[PDB]
Structure 1
Amino acid sequence: ESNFGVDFVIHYKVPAAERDEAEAGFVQLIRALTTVGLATEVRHGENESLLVFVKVASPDLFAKQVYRARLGDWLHGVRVSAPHNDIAQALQDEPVVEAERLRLIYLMITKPHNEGGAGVTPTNAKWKHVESIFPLHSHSFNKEWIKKWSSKYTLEQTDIDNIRDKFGESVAFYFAFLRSYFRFLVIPSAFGFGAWLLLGQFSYLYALLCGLWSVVFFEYWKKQEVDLAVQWGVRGVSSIQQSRPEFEWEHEAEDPITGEPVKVYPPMKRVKTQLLQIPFALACVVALGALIVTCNSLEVFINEVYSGPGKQYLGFLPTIFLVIGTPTISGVLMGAAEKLNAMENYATVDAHDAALIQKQFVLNFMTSYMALFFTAFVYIPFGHILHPFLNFWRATAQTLTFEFQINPARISNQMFYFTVTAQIVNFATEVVVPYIKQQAFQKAKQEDHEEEAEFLQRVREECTLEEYDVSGDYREMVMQFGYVAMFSVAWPLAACCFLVNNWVELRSDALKIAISSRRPIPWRTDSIGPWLTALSFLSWLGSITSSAIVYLCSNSPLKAWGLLLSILFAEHFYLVVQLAVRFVLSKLDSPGLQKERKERFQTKKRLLQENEHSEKITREALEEEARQASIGTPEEMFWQRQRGMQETIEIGRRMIEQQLAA
């Protein structure tokens, strides 16, 4: 239940074929790891692996790296005040949290020789036998965290701060976003329950309220996010960039900002592959569109038209079949997007991650909302263009076995099906399936001087677990917010159902980092990043889509000017409430920015405190008339008219007398 002081573990898989080359790479690697000053020790692993364990040897060397990294943060404006010296007073002023500690150790093992560490990064360099580097878990803290999170009804800020301290700013920002999104989701849950009973099906007022809620949630999250970035000391990390190791470059250009000159990739090749990404997206659009029109037409055919052979559940099967088939096609599309993003060089890790989020968001947008879009904007207004598909299915079924009545309430059943079906299969695939797969591997598996067998056992089991990426849970929550933003007017209870899911999701991902995945390398982030852009786009499209859906599915016939007027009125109401909420949150005066600028002014004011009259006037005028006497003349005689101030007083008084006389 306790680690042995291991800061980091390196796997170093050794293949049997490339044996002695891996031996040479291993000894060169451990020479690099003793060069950087980390105490290292080698242990056996499964499948010809040498799990090496690295910790800080000298706490003075570790505090030296701490001071250097804090200085590098302060040079780029991240830290408000400079660390003074390694007199141990720096650690006494601001203590090193475990997230910062493991981040600086990973920077010592990862950064190249110019920065101050060894480069062991496997993909670019000769260290191909290095499989992965990871920090261990603390099972006592893990059990205490999962018990305290399952016991609590809501989560305090100190739980998010503990998640920060032990897991990094990215995981902390995710759990803070989930907490704030749950506590803001409690509002349209209640109003959707109060608009499903009291108000009619497809109410306009719920659409306008959902637009208002989406705006105020997005802007309040942005304000809370910059407040948290002030509080954790991580504000401004988006400006400093981290170079990517997998970057390949042609030549090297001059230093733009700093002193050292950087490498460059000619961007025309990047624009070439970035225009290559577009036919892939169009092919995904037409493939998913053909699949969804095939499945939806077959579902409509066997449900409404073909009520002969085959029962009702035979009719209900293929849409459920599509929903279960959706993870695999989503997985191969995400793998294709990842390979295409790895195909293009991005010099910074931030631009690489942003392009990856953009591709994954486009793909998950299509595979999440294409069915509801083809239901709302195709099947309801003009389902006569899909009517020859019904004749095609009739003609195939007539040879196989030897009037449409389109209803506007099918979108409600489809939205309810997507909601409960997606959350059930998501909870199944998220936590249940990997846990029972780990139990199956434990049953499949069922020296070291008998002190560490229980420890090296859990280390070898932690080796096999995949690394936890927070982008997936961000993508799940952003897709859920898109559901609430643009399709909750179909099923007004769905937000309420999402509310319940969010509560267990706030524990479920808290379990998934706990026992189902290894500890992620703790990175620092300013914000959630591109998910702000995706969230704002989902809100803006949510207003238009909600009002277009409420007008069309409201249902002498539908007139075009009603649809256009409702869309324009909702979009302008969205812009108006956006300006109003931005104005109020501009006036609300969050405390962290205030305390930041106050402490900065106190620092510069300490630097400030680090740093008769008519006698002086008559003295400098005396030097002026002395310079006149040394040698133009009218201005000097003009200023020598009235040198003394009392002379000006009495001359002004007699001037007032002269103006009195005239």
Structure 2
Amino acid sequence: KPDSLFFTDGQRRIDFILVYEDESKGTNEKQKRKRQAYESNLICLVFVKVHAPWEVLCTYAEIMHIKLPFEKSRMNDFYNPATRSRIVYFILSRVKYQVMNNVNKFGINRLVSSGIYKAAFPLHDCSERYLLYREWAHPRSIYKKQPLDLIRKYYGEKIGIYFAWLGYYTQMLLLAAVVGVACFLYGYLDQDNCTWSKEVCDPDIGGQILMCPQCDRLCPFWRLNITCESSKKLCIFDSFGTLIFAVFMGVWVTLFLEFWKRRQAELEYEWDTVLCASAVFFWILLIIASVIGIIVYRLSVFIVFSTTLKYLTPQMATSITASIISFIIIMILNTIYEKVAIMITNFELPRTQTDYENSLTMKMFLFQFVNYYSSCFYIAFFKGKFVGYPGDPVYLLGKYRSEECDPGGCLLELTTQLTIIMGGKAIWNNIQEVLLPWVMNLIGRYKRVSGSEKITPRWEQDYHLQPMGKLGLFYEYLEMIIQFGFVTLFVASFPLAPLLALVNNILEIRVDAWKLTTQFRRMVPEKAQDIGAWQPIMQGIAILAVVTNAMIIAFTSDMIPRLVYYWSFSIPPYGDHTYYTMDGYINNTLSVFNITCRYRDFRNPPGHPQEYKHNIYYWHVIAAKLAFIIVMEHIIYSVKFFIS
């Protein structure tokens, strides 16, 4: 029978499979009779079946305290196919191989690494798999609520916590999405009567500003008018779409953390749930330097691409193409890091599985942080600075100049990077997660055995399925923490970032689910009280996110400069208006340059006693930026103090 969950005699559900074949140079007999006696003490091509009867599960459940299934009691009570796999795995790990020459091994952790065995896994049916396939696997059930209790009871506590965290995620990124939509409509509608994003488009005030080339050569004296196509759509990320949006984002990120702490407490109430500087930091410093190589490649790309060539402005198509190239390079370099972190972690002598995975987290998460967010931090914080008296950039300790931004507090490049990285990867990781299992399963089914007997045993089909590995949910937490960082660190621009995430996760909460019910082999239902080794990382990300949001609003949003302009530079002090009006902002902010243009920085005109040194406007604006940072951060940690 193809749907055989039992033995030949029947009435005995299979709990595990392990496969090996050492019948056939010279050394083969050694592992042959190593594994020949290994199964002997475990007793209470052929697929070695492992089952745990009542008297075995009862006698080996005494070691670990697990609340059996009304109400529950500690270790003993009276009123689960999932826990059998974990019990069998624990039995395999505890029972060792006894010899007479002092070479003792326990479990197959070392056995499968050497190569004695081939594979080991539990198996499920073809029931709870179909009912979970219909409303939870296929993307048609977008709005259907998931049975997280069923997920916990079927695919283990770790997967249940991962999905509940994702279920809780879009449960309250919909409010962030609707706030983003409100800011979206405010920015889009109020593109006319605000003297911003209309001055730039108007050829009389924001069109007569003759800039000067940003780089050394092969750039002409452009005009601000060309900014129109990207300035009219800039206000959506500016104005009220920036200040209250990011303040609400900070309050939200500080509050739902504690809200999900309460959710975790509720879950615990429901379920039981009871030399360093070198090499390691050397490679991180090397990639901190290698972002320079990445941007050098990016320039070497678009310099040629500009000569090669829906209102596709140069700074839109160029930025999109550059972001795609950088994303491809980031994926390749992430593959390189996936190799090197593993190759350096096993070099050190680690502790058991828990500490090994904790160290692997502490290394790979930082590797991915510096791999992904380095470019975003470069563009956001220290990209378009350092222009002085003769217009001399820092030159980066060489003969190569630095790149300069646009008169908007360059954020369109940042939001394009966000959209193409966290949005492009959203497509691409799902593409691999859906298609790689199909293509490899088809390769196995069309290259190993073809034309079966029309009755395929369950173990054979499961063996043909892809393994899940010990780093099962590590990669999902990694990608989701990357999404979390992109949706909380840089959420000042792109108000629709959670919404772009929202539907994303609604697909993922199915797609992953789908790949967890049809593609990968069933995983042992491990028990965990939380996400683990990521929650402190989440707290650190939130603490850094408050500061980085303040720095995004101040140093690279050009919102504080306009607030300052219509509060203190528009009034009769420093100005000629009557009340808080934003008129004349663009002309009365940019500073003049003498070639012997008008660049973006705030500096004195050529002939002030302090020429090309910062003026009163710059110092006022930077004092306002620092005050805004201090006030917002203090208010945010005060708010989280009230919350927790």
Q: Superposed, which structure 2 residues align to 1:425-436 within 5 Å?
A: 425-436=428-439
1:322 corresponding residue in structure 2: 326
1:66 corresponding residue in structure 2: 61
| SS of corresponding position for 1:343 | coil
Give the counterpart letter for 1:21 in structure 2: K
Give the counterpart letter for 1:218 in structure 2: L
Q: Superposed, which structure 2 residues align to 1:228-627 within 5 Å?
A: 228-235=267-274, 272-273=275-276, 276-287=279-290, 289-298=291-300, 301=303, 307-310=306-309, 317-382=321-386, 408=410, 409-445=412-448, 453-462=456-465, 469-555=472-558, 556=589, 557=602, 559-582=621-644
Aligned mates of 1:186, 1:70 — CA distance in 2 = 40
Query: C-alpha offsets along residues 297-333 of structure 1, whole Å, 9 cap, x if unaligned?
Result: 3456457xxx434497788544312212322211221
Deviation at 1:573, TM superposition (A): 2.1
Residue ranges of structure 1 left out of the alignment (5+ in a row): 38-43, 45-49, 85-89, 236-271, 395-402, 583-662
2:50 corresponding residue in structure 1: 54
Give the counterpart letter for 2:339 in structure 1: G
Aligned mates of 1:113, 1:430 — CA distance in 2 = 37
Deviation at 1:552, TM superposition (A): 2.5
With the length of structure 1 as denominator, give the TM-score of the two structures: 0.68
Deviation at 1:291, TM superposition (A): 3.2
Aligned mates of 1:337, 1:228 — CA distance in 2 = 34
CA distance 1:546–1:469, change in 2 (3 Å)? same
Which one of the candidate residues 168, 177, 202 is aligned to 2:165? 177
| SS of corresponding position for 1:176 | helix
Deviation at 1:286, TM superposition (A): 2.3
Aligned mates of 1:125, 1:485 — CA distance in 2 = 42
Give the counterpart letter for 1:179 in structure 2: G
Q: Superposed, which structure 2 residues align to 1:623-662 within 5 Å?
A: none
Give the percent of matched residue pairs that are identical in Structure 1 and Structure 2: 21
Residue ranges of structure 2 left out of the alignment (5+ in a row): 7-12, 98-103, 188-234, 559-588, 590-601, 603-617
Is the contact between residue 292 and residue 370 of structure 1 (CA under 8 Å) also seen in structure 2?
A: no
Give the counterpart letter for 1:369 in structure 2: Y
Aligned mates of 1:314, 1:540 — CA distance in 2 = 34
2:155 corresponding residue in structure 1: 167
Is the contact between residue 380 and residue 406 of structure 1 (CA under 8 Å) also seen in structure 2?
A: no
Deviation at 1:547, TM superposition (A): 1.9
Name the stretch that deviates more: 339-348 or 326-335: 339-348
Aligned mates of 1:80, 1:140 — CA distance in 2 = 26
Aligned mates of 1:385, 1:294 — CA distance in 2 = 19
Is the contact between residue 96 and residue 107 of structure 2 (CA under 8 Å) also seen in structure 1?
A: no
Deviation at 1:520, TM superposition (A): 1.6
Query: C-alpha offsets along residues 330-362 of structure 1, whole Å, 9 cap, x if unaligned?
Result: 122123222333233343432222221121211
Query: C-alpha offsets along residues 482-534 of structure 1, whole Å, 9 cap, x if unaligned?
Result: 11111121211121111110100100110222233222222111111121111
Aligned mates of 2:368, 2:359 — CA distance in 1 = 14
Aligned mates of 2:163, 2:300 — CA distance in 1 = 41
Aligned mates of 2:415, 2:318 — CA distance in 1 = 21
Deviation at 1:125, TM superposition (A): 9.3
Deviation at 1:276, TM superposition (A): 5.0
Instruction: Work out the number of aligned pairs and report it.
Output: 502
CA distance 1:188–1:128, change in 2 (3 Å)? same
Deviation at 1:186, TM superposition (A): 1.0
Which one of the candidate residues 14, 32, 42 is aligned to 2:41? 32
| SS of corresponding position for 1:378 | coil
Name the stretch that deviates more: 14-23 or 3-12: 14-23
Aligned mates of 2:292, 2:261 — CA distance in 1 = 39
1:205 corresponding residue in structure 2: 244
Is the contact between residue 19 and residue 47 of structure 2 (CA under 8 Å) also seen in structure 1?
A: yes
With the length of structure 2 as denominator, give the TM-score of the two structures: 0.70
Is the contact between residue 19 and residue 119 of structure 2 (CA under 8 Å) also seen in structure 1?
A: yes
Of Structure 1 and Structure 2, the greater helix share is in 1
Is the contact between residue 334 and residue 363 of structure 1 (CA under 8 Å) also seen in structure 2?
A: no
CA distance 1:475–1:458, change in 2 (3 Å)? same
Q: Superposed, which structure 2 residues align to 1:27-176 within 5 Å?
A: 27-34=36-43, 37=44, 44=45, 51-56=47-52, 58-70=53-65, 81-84=73-76, 90=77, 92-93=78-79, 97-113=80-96, 119-123=106-110, 128-149=115-136, 150=138, 152-154=141-143, 156=145, 159-176=147-164
Aligned Cα RMSD in Å? 3.5
| SS of corresponding position for 2:266 | helix
CA distance 1:519–1:572, change in 2 (3 Å)? same
Is the contact between residue 33 and residue 118 of structure 1 (CA under 8 Å) also seen in structure 2?
A: no
Aligned mates of 2:106, 2:337 — CA distance in 1 = 32
CA distance 1:80–1:579, change in 2 (3 Å)? farther
Larger Rg: 1
Aligned mates of 1:155, 1:109 — CA distance in 2 = 39
CA distance 1:25–1:380, change in 2 (3 Å)? same
CA distance 1:223–1:538, change in 2 (3 Å)? same
